[PDB]
Design a protein around this nucleic acid. Structure first.
Lengths: 85, 75, 93, 75, 71, 69, 82
RNA sequence: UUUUA
């Protein structure tokens, strides 16, 4: 893979799925198909209509993430919501 | 013995086809393939809109298989 | 390649392509490939005023994946030979 | 930790499946294949927009739309 | 394959097929293939809660199938 | 193939409805497209306005049609 | 010059990626493959409505989520020269 | 993982 996931081992990453779901969790494992094991997962819930984040979260614990539905992966450290650059 | 046999046994018969996007077809099946691409002859389309239906007629109609949901042979 | 061959028999005849985005384009079929991409010439768009960006286009390429339908006038020879060919594929393949 | 080994360790135990759409399933993991199509038994299906739930005795779930598989089931 | 074992044991029995659109089909599972294309006999179609169609035989293209459930 | 359109001005319509007008420079077997000197043309009924956009690589699955101009 | 050949030549340079849902990612292209999977560095993520923005140190984008990419004309010129 | 999801 062009992404060396071992660099994120035991770091919190953000994952976005096709269809809009967004989670964060601590990377505990992965395979060559980009399935992941994340711990301490939180899902950022969205509004039913607008599909935009509401600010609320739900805790999901230890989760297997399917690599087929993953569309975005990014480390949390160094991220931040910013004003219009 | 395999699902496509239902379509095979419908060649030259009037079939009903349910498609994505709230569309239905009734027409004589002249050919199909493993994608469920098909050609229907003397075909009627019913487009449902939300409640209302629009009816259209085609002398000869190629249908791309990726829109197909269901095919029913005639009774 | 049953439907590839079918469409090659329609080259230089008039067809109408209905796209999944609900635009319909009538024109002369000039080309088709294994993916059922098509090229149309001397096109006319149905409800053309709804698609003003098409007004200066005379020739176009359509990706096979965005086609919902291709419809055309019927001919007896076309229909019986196409059914023949489908049955031939079934007996052989 | 290998993701599919965690899933295999969940066989016979509760598994909670979150689809890409507003739909979830929770039940006993019977088994799964190389595409992670999954067989669940004693299942509850959740529409997370309407809140309606349905029960199923045993079912094969298409893995195409699965986003998350959570061993231990749903709280 | 557990998916194949389950399917093999509901062949010839009544099953509920839910499509990704949420449209439901209840029928007798005749056979299937590697694409999850299905053939059903004695098929009832349901939209929301209401029965909208019946088919003596129906072919269902496998890409739309969300699940196959035993009844 | 699209080779007949290379180095010609084309309009590309995308699945999201965008209209791109540029010089087709290359394509591949997915109908991925590479366009140079591209503008995005935004329509409201028969009116439009253009945005300079530069070079695009359009992923083929998003291409509805390509028309010679 | 094929589209993916240009993409490979864009490594190390600024790029704009628009996703199928209209999100955009401005960053430097770190890597790509024949799926059009991408890795970017020093990223600005703009949400579809243009209303919320995020800074990411790096990110990975699966190729089948991409609508299009934009690159500088200067890049195409310099790559054609070499 | 783009033209048969």
């Amino acid at each position: 893979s062009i992404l060396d996931l071992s660099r994120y081992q035991d770091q919190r990453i953000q994952a976005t799925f096709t269809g809009g779901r967004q989670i964060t969790g601590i990377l505990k494992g992965f395979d060559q198909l980009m399935n992941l094991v994340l711990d301490d997962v939180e899902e950022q819930l969205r509004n039913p209509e607008d599909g935009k984040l509401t600010g609320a979260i739900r805790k999901l614990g230890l989760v297997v993430v399917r690599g087929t539905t993953l569309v975005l992966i990014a480390p949390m450290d160094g991220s931040e919501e910013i004003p219009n650059p | 013995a395999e699902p496509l046999d239902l379509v095979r046994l419908s060649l030259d018969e009037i079939v009903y086809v349910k498609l994505r996007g709230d569309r239905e077809l009734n027409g004589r099946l002249h050919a199909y393939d493993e994608h469920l691409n098909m050609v229907l002859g003397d075909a009627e389309e019913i487009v449902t809109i939300f409640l209302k239906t629009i009816r259209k007629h085609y002398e000869m109609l190629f249908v791309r298989g990726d829109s197909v949901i269901l095919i029913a042979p005639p009774r | 390649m049953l439907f590839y061959s079918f469409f090659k028999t329609l080259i230089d005849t008039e067809v109408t392509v209905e796209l999944k985005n609900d635009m319909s384009i009538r024109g002369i079929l000039k080309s088709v490939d294994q993916f059922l991409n098509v090229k149309l010439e001397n096109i006319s768009v149905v409800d053309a005023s709804k698609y003003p960006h098409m007004a200066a286009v005379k020739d176009l390429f359509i990706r096979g994946s965005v086609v919902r339908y291709v419809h055309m006038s019927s001919a007896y020879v076309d229909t019986i030979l196409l059914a023949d060919a489908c049955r031939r594929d079934l007996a052989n393949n | 930790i290998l993701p599919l080994e965690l899933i295999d360790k969940c066989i016979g135990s509760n598994l909670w499946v979150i689809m890409k759409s507003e739909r979830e399933f929770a039940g006993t993991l019977v088994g799964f294949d190389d595409y992670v199509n999954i067989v669940l038994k004693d299942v509850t299906e959740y529409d997370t927009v309407t809140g309606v739930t349905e029960k199923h005795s045993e079912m094969l779930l298409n893995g195409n739309g699965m986003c998350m598989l959570i061993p231990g089931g749903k709280p | 394959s557990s998916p194949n074992e389950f399917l093999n044991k509901v062949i010839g029995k009544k099953v509920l097929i839910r499509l990704s659109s949420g449209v439901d089909y209840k029928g007798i599972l005749s056979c299937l293939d590697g694409y999850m294309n299905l053939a059903l006999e004695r098929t009832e179609e349901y939209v929301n809660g209401k029965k909208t169609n019946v088919y003596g035989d129906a072919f269902i293209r496998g890409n739309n199938v969300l699940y196959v459930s035993a009844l | 193939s699209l080779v007949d359109y290379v180095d010609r001005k084309v309009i590309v319509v995308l699945r999201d409805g965008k209209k791109l007008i540029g010089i087709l420079r290359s394509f591949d077997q997915f109908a991925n497209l590479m366009l140079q000197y591209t503008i995005e043309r935004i329509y409201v009924d028969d009116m439009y306005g253009d945005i300079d956009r530069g070079v695009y690589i359009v992923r083929g699955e998003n291409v509805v049609l390509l028309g010679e101009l | 010059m094929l589209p993916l050949t240009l993409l490979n030549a864009t490594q190390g340079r600024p790029i704009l990626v628009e996703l199928k849902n209209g999100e955009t990612f401005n960053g430097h292209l770190e890597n790509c493959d024949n799926y059009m999977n991408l890795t970017l560095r020093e990223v600005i993520r703009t949400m579809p409505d243009g209303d919320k923005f995020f800074r990411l140190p790096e990110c990975y984008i699966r190729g089948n989520n991409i609508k299009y990419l934009r690159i500088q004309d200067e890049v195409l010129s310099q790559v054609a020269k070499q």
